[PDB]
Design a protein around this motif. Structure first.
Motif, PDB file in Angstrom:
ATOM      1  N   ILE A  57      41.249  21.849 -27.241  1.00 28.14           N
ATOM      2  CA  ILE A  57      40.790  23.137 -26.723  1.00 28.14           C
ATOM      3  C   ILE A  57      40.860  23.159 -25.200  1.00 28.14           C
ATOM      4  CG2 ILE A  57      38.808  24.675 -26.537  1.00 28.14           C
ATOM      5  CD1 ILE A  57      40.259  24.820 -29.160  1.00 28.14           C
ATOM      6  N   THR A  58      40.096  22.289 -24.548  1.00 28.87           N
ATOM      7  CA  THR A  58      40.093  22.184 -23.097  1.00 28.87           C
ATOM      8  C   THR A  58      40.314  20.731 -22.702  1.00 28.87           C
ATOM      9  OG1 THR A  58      37.684  21.930 -23.024  1.00 28.87           O
ATOM     10  CG2 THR A  58      38.560  24.159 -22.852  1.00 28.87           C
ATOM     11  N   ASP A  59      40.452  20.500 -21.401  1.00 28.98           N
ATOM     12  CA  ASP A  59      40.503  19.138 -20.901  1.00 28.98           C
ATOM     13  C   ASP A  59      39.136  18.496 -21.071  1.00 28.98           C
ATOM     14  N   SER A  60      39.129  17.217 -21.427  1.00 32.52           N
ATOM     15  CA  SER A  60      37.870  16.560 -21.726  1.00 32.52           C
ATOM     16  C   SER A  60      37.199  16.077 -20.445  1.00 32.52           C
ATOM     17  CB  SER A  60      38.089  15.381 -22.677  1.00 32.52           C
ATOM     18  OG  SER A  60      38.671  15.803 -23.898  1.00 32.52           O
ATOM     19  N   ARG A  61      35.881  15.969 -20.504  1.00 34.14           N
ATOM     20  CA  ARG A  61      35.089  15.337 -19.463  1.00 34.14           C
ATOM     21  C   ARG A  61      34.289  14.194 -20.079  1.00 34.14           C
ATOM     22  NH1 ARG A  61      30.367  19.798 -17.974  1.00 34.14           N
ATOM     23  NH2 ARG A  61      29.516  20.047 -20.089  1.00 34.14           N
ATOM     24  N   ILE A 105      28.314  15.551 -21.537  1.00 38.14           N
ATOM     25  CA  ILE A 105      27.988  16.972 -21.574  1.00 38.14           C
ATOM     26  C   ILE A 105      27.261  17.423 -20.312  1.00 38.14           C
ATOM     27  CG2 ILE A 105      25.760  16.673 -22.700  1.00 38.14           C
ATOM     28  CD1 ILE A 105      26.454  19.179 -24.401  1.00 38.14           C
ATOM     29  N   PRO A 109      33.400  26.210 -24.805  1.00 39.71           N
ATOM     30  CA  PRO A 109      33.267  24.800 -25.234  1.00 39.71           C
ATOM     31  C   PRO A 109      32.521  23.949 -24.207  1.00 39.71           C
ATOM     32  CG  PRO A 109      35.482  25.221 -24.452  1.00 39.71           C
ATOM     33  CD  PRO A 109      34.785  26.552 -24.442  1.00 39.71           C
ATOM     34  N   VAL A 110      31.192  23.987 -24.289  1.00 41.90           N
ATOM     35  CA  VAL A 110      30.372  23.236 -23.344  1.00 41.90           C
ATOM     36  C   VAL A 110      30.387  21.749 -23.683  1.00 41.90           C
ATOM     37  CG1 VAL A 110      28.061  23.007 -22.353  1.00 41.90           C
ATOM     38  CG2 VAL A 110      28.950  25.275 -22.930  1.00 41.90           C
ATOM     39  N   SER A 112      36.649  22.674 -16.451  1.00 40.36           N
ATOM     40  CA  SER A 112      37.091  22.338 -17.800  1.00 40.36           C
ATOM     41  C   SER A 112      36.376  23.172 -18.856  1.00 40.36           C
ATOM     42  CB  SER A 112      36.868  20.848 -18.065  1.00 40.36           C
ATOM     43  OG  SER A 112      35.487  20.529 -18.068  1.00 40.36           O
ATOM     44  N   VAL A 113      35.163  23.637 -18.561  1.00 38.99           N
ATOM     45  CA  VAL A 113      34.379  24.350 -19.561  1.00 38.99           C
ATOM     46  C   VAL A 113      34.808  25.814 -19.654  1.00 38.99           C
ATOM     47  CG1 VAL A 113      32.036  24.880 -20.298  1.00 38.99           C
ATOM     48  CG2 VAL A 113      32.497  22.739 -19.120  1.00 38.99           C
TER      49      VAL A 113
END
Lengths: 224, 218, 238, 224, 218, 60
Positions: free
Chosen positions: D215-219, D222, E54-55, E90-91
């Motif tokens: 979905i998005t780039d990961s971090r 949280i 997408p948190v 990114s979020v």
């Protein structure tokens, strides 16, 4: 493909001016620049008639009588120097024709001609309704010479002229072979007396002669 | 003088343009237009003319005038049957309707059919003319044709029955089958076998859009 | 509590998301004439209830042909080759008060889905099984079928921003019912009902179902479709 | 860079005509002038579709349905003589195509074509909304052939035509290799039914097939 | 005739011009425009639609739908925290908001956030949603978040709390952290661990200027 | 169409001309003009300001 709901109501594309008035290439020809001072391969002729190619000829035979201005635009190329200048001389039905590239007819003041030099936009020359009668006749059930002589089907009313094309350059060091493509287009066209479409293929460009062709493509039985 | 700047598309030759062509013979004044009878101002005036449809175009009867004649006078198989689309159909493709429609890619409208019974003035019978919608399957029997759309055309009363088939367009069509409701009843003097001519034109008004070159010419 | 009825089908309901702000309507020519059934067709067609467990990734139905075996509407699809309708879609969940979860009920017009292993196609029975729903999957799959992994629902888009379409959230904390009205989105006024899937009702659980060891291990999701303003082509002569 | 006070209030650049109506190069191709009289390397084709390059394709997939006139301007070069003249023939969806550089289709009156000679401004040809339906469909969840046959996702409503390009010069002494760059531009564009943006990369130019992408780039966590 | 003179810029092809293109099919009359539902007349009508953010996009939870779920149910570290800028974050970069903003270089406006609590109907607790201004540092504790801007969002009363974050532009941004004010209080029947979904759109109106190519496509 | 004829001076580039340049970014709408203090509308507004004159500009 699939059968879609073709929902609209228009017949603007079915009018005569939107059906006939389309430019189509009707005359390709070669003509040199030098050599053979008495030759017929240094200029083009193309006596202007609608019976040039069968695709356009078929459309003009939907109608018996029609009158229209013509507006042709030539597309001239060259192969193998200086910059070249051409001459597209339209002679009327009553007009002298050249016999050679250096004839005196080319200098006739009553034969309008365009002098297009290479590199510019294509030359466009427009010719009005020339004919003696009141319309051009696609078909002429009659004899040119009285008392049923020769030449069936050819009237002199639907004579449109000729189109003599040459280089104006007198000579060249090497050989240059130019190609011209005349784009004929009817304009401001009216048409009378509709007529059924051609069924048989065309034989010759000056007559209506044909081979007896079948009506439609055959199928196996009457019920399949 | 006036500062102009040439756009893209200058000094080109677009084949389909409507520019003012410089006239070669300006002094020349053209012949006055007399009134000639029968002017055409629209192509769809040719499609509205009825013309005979070669329904009996079987393998050996297309170079004669037996193509136009539907023989009338076995009640289990239909008299005739054909696709109802003036394009890509052997029966309706060389009609005045079907021939002015091959100059175009998008066309849509309705089409009327006239069945002229060319038998005797004493022959009497019934024919059942069924129409199938463009998605439906053909009737295999006379009863299954009766349960759909039909017109029981009494020959002894009227000799010409007119249809009007809608939903005719291209950019899987209908069917006009015909059945023996009754046989042809005939007195001792009149002949037994008769013919039925067919016709086709545009029913009310016809829509047609995209001009192309015809496939027939080579 | 409102007890709606249509024809011979009554359901019991408990706010409507009118899709794209328009209510379905009829098409309003003698060259092509539509037939308006009105009778029947408009009744409620309740599909089979769908059990939503803790590990359910989602479902999708492809309409109009999800109703291809549903009564007169599924029978007029075989006799007329052109049609259009509106499809009021009720989605109840009738969970308890101790169940928790959240659903995305979205309609997605023109959901062109992608094959699982690209360079090939799928055998056309993988998009739809009339009444029953094709489930999504939690991860990637292979084989000649639809790439049914959530996070890339069918179309290669993000599944979170699938909210652009006519949607409704079913948060079991607050509500249980959803209703969506989809006014026949198409580029041609009438189209065949077997070739073209006008929209794709897909129900996607964002927050997963959860409960304790005493409750029922599932929550049945009930789908009900009412084809509104259905009109077809004409079969009669003119 | 630094975060400045970006103070203004405007959404004129976010309208559909100011978002889609931008000219982008969609077709490079080579085509010779001479040799190999029966060859496919003496003309260009480019069936016109929006699914040409992924940068423009992505913008057309913001919306399900859209209708628009197209106004393409070619940019034609040459390498290695005379002055060259080209021909850019647009055939409609219902139109015959050439098989060779010297086919008869090139002379079809219903196929509009521009004859651009070298040195002038680039040729511009504009094409209206051709489609049979009421809009072009970016996505088609359906089957071309009834009863769930082959060819998923391809409708014939969003067919725009083709673009055959050749030299009109018949021959040349040496080899001339021309390069054409077609600049596609939507015009007078309307768009219906918005749609979420593409997430996964494109696989093929005739389908929507994809590889499952994150979905998005990961971090890391949280909360970081 | 008219004396004209060509300026600099004649016979050139500027890619971004709005000149009258000569139409190739002049006779052709295009299909009439029917009314199709759901017309877009401006791109910022897509940014105003809420969509799930997408948190929880940690290193192993981005190809599943666990990216969208914020686990609720240690009070010393915040539940979640992210930069408040739809670009280069990114979020918020693949949101409908954050994806129609990567087509542009200059954009400025506000952004609203909706926190939908997707837990049980019996679970009750409090969450403290703090906002830091674009220059300020993040709160390291719950008390330091309480002394700034916050909203103590009671879950048992309302299940959806809406923000509206201003000063969002590029041409060092805010923070939306969330804290356990109280734990999630739950009866013996309902489950203990819940989820919180997030949403994002344009709050009132959004300004955006300079179009560019998107970075995502390769 | 309209019969035009190019004068001497066509297709040249005079450095000091004031012709309508075709804008490269037509869609682009520029930033609104705020009021900034101290606008100059004429150069001779700089000459009217007093300034110190180096009269004692001897060699060192």
């Amino acid at each position: 493909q699939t059968r879609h709901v073709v929902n609209f109501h228009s017949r603007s594309e079915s009018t005569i001016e939107n059906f006939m008035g389309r430019a189509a290439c009707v005359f390709m020809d070669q003509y040199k620049i030098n050599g053979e001072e008495t030759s017929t391969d240094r200029f083009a002729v193309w006596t202007i008639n609608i019976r040039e190619m069968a695709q356009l000829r078929r459309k003009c035979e939907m109608f018996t009588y029609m009158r229209f201005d013509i507006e042709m635009t030539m597309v001239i190329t060259s192969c193998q120097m200086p910059v070249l200048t051409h001459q597209i001389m339209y002679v009327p039905p009553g007009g002298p024709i050249p016999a050679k590239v250096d004839g005196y007819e080319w200098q006739t003041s009553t034969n309008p001609s365009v002098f297009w030099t290479e590199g510019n936009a294509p030359p466009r020359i427009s010719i009005p309704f020339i004919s003696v009668g009141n319309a051009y006749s696609s078909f002429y059930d009659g004899w040119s010479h009285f008392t049923q002589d020769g030449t069936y089907g050819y009237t002199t009313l639907n004579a449109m002229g000729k189109l003599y094309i040459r280089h104006v350059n007198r000579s060249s060091p090497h050989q240059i072979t130019s190609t011209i493509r005349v784009y004929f287009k009817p304009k401001h066209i009216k048409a009378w007396v509709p007529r059924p479409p051609r069924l048989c293929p065309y034989i010759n460009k000056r007559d209506v002669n044909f081979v007896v062709t079948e009506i439609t493509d055959s199928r196996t039985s009457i019920t399949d | 003088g006036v500062p102009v700047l040439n756009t893209p598309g200058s000094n080109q030759f677009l084949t389909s343009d409507d520019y003012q062509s410089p006239s070669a013979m300006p002094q020349f004044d053209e012949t006055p237009e007399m009134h000639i009878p029968g002017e055409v101002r629209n192509l769809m005036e040719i499609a509205e003319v009825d013309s005979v449809v070669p329904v009996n175009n079987v393998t050996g009867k297309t170079k004669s005038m037996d193509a136009y004649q539907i023989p009338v006078g076995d009640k289990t198989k239909p008299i005739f049957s054909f696709q109802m689309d003036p394009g890509y159909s052997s029966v309706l493709k060389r009609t005045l309707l079907g021939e002015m429609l091959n100059y175009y890619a998008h066309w849509s409208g309705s089409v009327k059919l006239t069945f002229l019974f060319c038998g005797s003035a004493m022959a009497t019978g019934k024919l059942l003319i069924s129409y199938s919608p463009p998605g439906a399957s053909v009737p295999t029997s006379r009863k299954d044709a009766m349960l759909g759309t039909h017109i029981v055309w009494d020959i002894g009363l009227q000799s010409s029955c007119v249809l009007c088939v809608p939903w005719i367009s291209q950019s899987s069509a209908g069917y006009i089958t015909c059945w023996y409701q009754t046989n042809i009843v005939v007195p001792p003097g009149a002949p037994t076998s008769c013919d039925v001519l067919c016709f086709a034109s545009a029913c009310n008004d016809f829509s047609v859009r995209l001009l192309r070159d015809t496939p027939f010419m080579a | 509590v409102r007890s709606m009825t249509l024809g011979n089908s009554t359901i019991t309901t408990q706010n409507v998301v009118v899709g794209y702000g328009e209510w379905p309507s009829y098409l309003s020519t003698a060259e092509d004439q539509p037939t308006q059934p009105d009778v029947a067709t408009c009744r409620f067609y309740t599909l089979e209830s769908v059990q939503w467990e803790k590990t359910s990734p989602g479902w999708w139905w492809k309409f109009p042909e999800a109703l291809k075996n549903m009564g007169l509407f599924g029978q007029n699809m075989h006799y007329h080759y052109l049609g259009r309708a509106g499809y009021t879609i009720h989605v109840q969940c009738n969970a308890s008060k101790f169940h928790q979860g959240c659903l995305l009920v979205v309609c997605v017009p023109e959901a062109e889905m992608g094959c699982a292993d690209t360079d090939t196609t799928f055998p056309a029975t993988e998009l739809t099984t009339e009444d029953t729903p094709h489930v999504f999957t939690s991860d990637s799959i292979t084989g000649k079928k639809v790439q049914a992994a959530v996070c890339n629902a069918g179309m290669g888009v993000g599944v979170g921003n699938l909210t652009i379409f006519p949607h409704q959230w079913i948060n079991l904390r607050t509500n249980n019912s959803a209703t969506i009205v989809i006014p026949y989105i198409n580029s041609v006024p009438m189209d065949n009902m077997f070739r073209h899937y006008n929209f794709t009702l897909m129900i996607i659980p964002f927050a997963p179902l959860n409960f304790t060891d005493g409750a029922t291990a599932y929550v049945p999701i009930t789908v009900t479709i009412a084809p509104m303003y259905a009109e077809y082509n004409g079969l009669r002569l003119a």
